[PDB]
Amino acid sequence: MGKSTLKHTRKIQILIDLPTKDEKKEVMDMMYQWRDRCFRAANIIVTHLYVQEMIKDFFYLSEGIKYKLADEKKDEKGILQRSRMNTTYRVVSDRFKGEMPTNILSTLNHGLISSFNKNRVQYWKGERSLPNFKKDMAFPFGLQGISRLVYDEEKKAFCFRLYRVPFKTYLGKDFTDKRMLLERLVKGDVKLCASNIQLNGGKIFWLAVFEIEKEKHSLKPEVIAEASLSLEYPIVVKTGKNRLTIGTKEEFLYRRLAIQAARRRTQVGATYSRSGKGKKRKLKAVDKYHKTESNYVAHRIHVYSRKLIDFCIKHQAGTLILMNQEDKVGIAKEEEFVLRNWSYYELMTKIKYKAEKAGIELIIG
Amino acid sequence: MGKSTLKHTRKIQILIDLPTKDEKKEVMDMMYQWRDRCFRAANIIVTHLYVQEMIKDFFYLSESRMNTTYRVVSDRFKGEMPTNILSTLNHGLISSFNKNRVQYWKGERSLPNFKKDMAFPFGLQGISRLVYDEEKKAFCFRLYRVPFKTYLGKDFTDKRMLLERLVKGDVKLCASNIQLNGGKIFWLAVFEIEKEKHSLKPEVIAEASLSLEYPIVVKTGKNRLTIGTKEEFLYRRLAIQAARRRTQVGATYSRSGKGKKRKLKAVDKYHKTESNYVAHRIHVYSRKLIDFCIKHQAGTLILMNQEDKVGIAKEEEFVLRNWSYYELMTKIKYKAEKAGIELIIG
DNA sequence: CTAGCG
């Protein structure tokens, strides 16, 4: 049977459920320490995953031996004294046990092993570099960390123990969307996967990953929704006698141009701003816009994709054709207008995942 | 107490000084073979130096410092791949790992792998017969028994003078790299140049003046520098002014009877900070202008008047007004006197 | 409830 669930990541804000500020500050320090140790652990993980592969390379080049990285107790040609995952897990555990729960290590290690296998061909070829894990990496955690999940009616928050550190969920005015997802969880009706935790400016965010089942609508395979990038208009979609134009030139280009003008002005005025304190503070105003344009354009793409998907759903379009541009049977380039290709800012990632969750068959033309 | 000699880098284009195109193809394929050998040897040396350094954390494997890796790579690629380049690379890798040892042990940075596009290094021993040829109208040298002619083309940049000083011996060369991007050979040359004692030359004339949309505009020789901008200097002033207006409006609607000082201390602070902002901005503009005058060895600084009458002026406010604004003249002349520059008012 | 291994 095929996979009927798609992993979705919901930002659930959790606050530390302790009375005083000293204990909350201690908890904050503990999680900051977890982040630091996790970033160091990931760097160690990937480095130790490079080194033994290049040991195999050096031995093959020196004496032509087809050494394979595996347990020597089970393999004649193996250079390893245990399983490679367990090897690098042993090194990270020996270097950082007791400062953090070991599930952070043993869910980081799996995520990095599973990726290095797929990048092995490139790494031997030489066309990719070794990841330098950031200091602001959200550390992963498994199902084993969540315990004592319970809806507390006294405090109107979902309460759980993330590794003997109690937490209440600060959903705010989200009585309908994620208060339902968590109660579907405490009752064992929805699955949780390995998640992450974010630490931004004194706030704790729970990047919980779930398994949201496919939605069942009335989709007609014969009906075709021809969405064409007349890339003047953001999205213009054809379906029989139905035409919907999603987005406007002033709505995307002009506001992103205003934010661009603000960013360039901040860069120009940053040279004579408060100096003498490094690259960070001079560029503070510029950095504020480092993550305003991305947020705005991501929201625009989310809105456009959702409106396209809804135009397909309401009109029962079972096949969404991305009609690209191909302008004038492959004629030369025109002057310009606004959105470029079908994969501009992860548009074809968003459309693909939303259509697959919605069940719409997707074809790229 | 840094090194008295500086290191500069220039990326120059180099052709093969051979008559037939087939010879060029063969030397280029050999050159790519050299690059691939350098890639493999570099990665092996880095990974195995990491292994030798951190044996105690490598307990999961089954049962000077240069020499072992150097011998291994030499026997791996002798004859097909020059030994001098190998030794220079091994020294570079070991030096880099020695520099980054602490961060390697703590886990703050993964092991830097090399790539297919990495430029292989080489010392001074590789380059031979570094001569400037007039018949071939370029700089010609024999790198590892192979002729090589550079392609500056219509290059008016500093590359020609640097190469001339290098062949003349005025500039020293360091262990450089040879790159091959898109079928073209680029020589990433690192030059060791002694920092010449910058002495002010009176023959240089440094013309500095004000403008209408450029706070300070300065001319000297063929180099142009613009100091600040209208909005750059105006943003903080307008911000202080707007803050003063809103605070005044709030105070007028605030609770009175507690003292006029308690009502207008914010206003006095705003006035003081606006004045101090203008003073600090003028001081930093003067600092930048003095640094510019120093860098180009201009010892005679003449400040243009450029006031005229009617014309385009007398209507625009002429940002920075005149040399009667917030003591620009006194600070600029004081800084010049401290630096020994000639300040002739015009 | 944690840690260990494939």
Place this chain on the structure above:
DNA sequence: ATCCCACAACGCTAG
């Protein structure tokens, strides 16, 4: 200082 493309998001058992 702009902009693609890839992979992850375990699962069981023992003290």
Place this chain on the structure above:
RNA sequence: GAGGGUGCUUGUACACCCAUAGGGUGAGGUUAAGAAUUACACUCACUAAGUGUGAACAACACAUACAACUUGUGGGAUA
């Protein structure tokens, strides 16, 4: 007055404050000067912001309309 903070995360408007925040500082390293001190587009860090009860810079309670809500880790491609 741009920009923010609180109103679950995001955008738009919306009250309320903060706001010279493109600012105010701290520490580490480097430099110049006889000194005061200056400099670093060098490194890292701190700091402002809703109403009520509440002695409280403790805690709790309350806090708008629309739309969005698959994110994270990494790499390769523009100085």
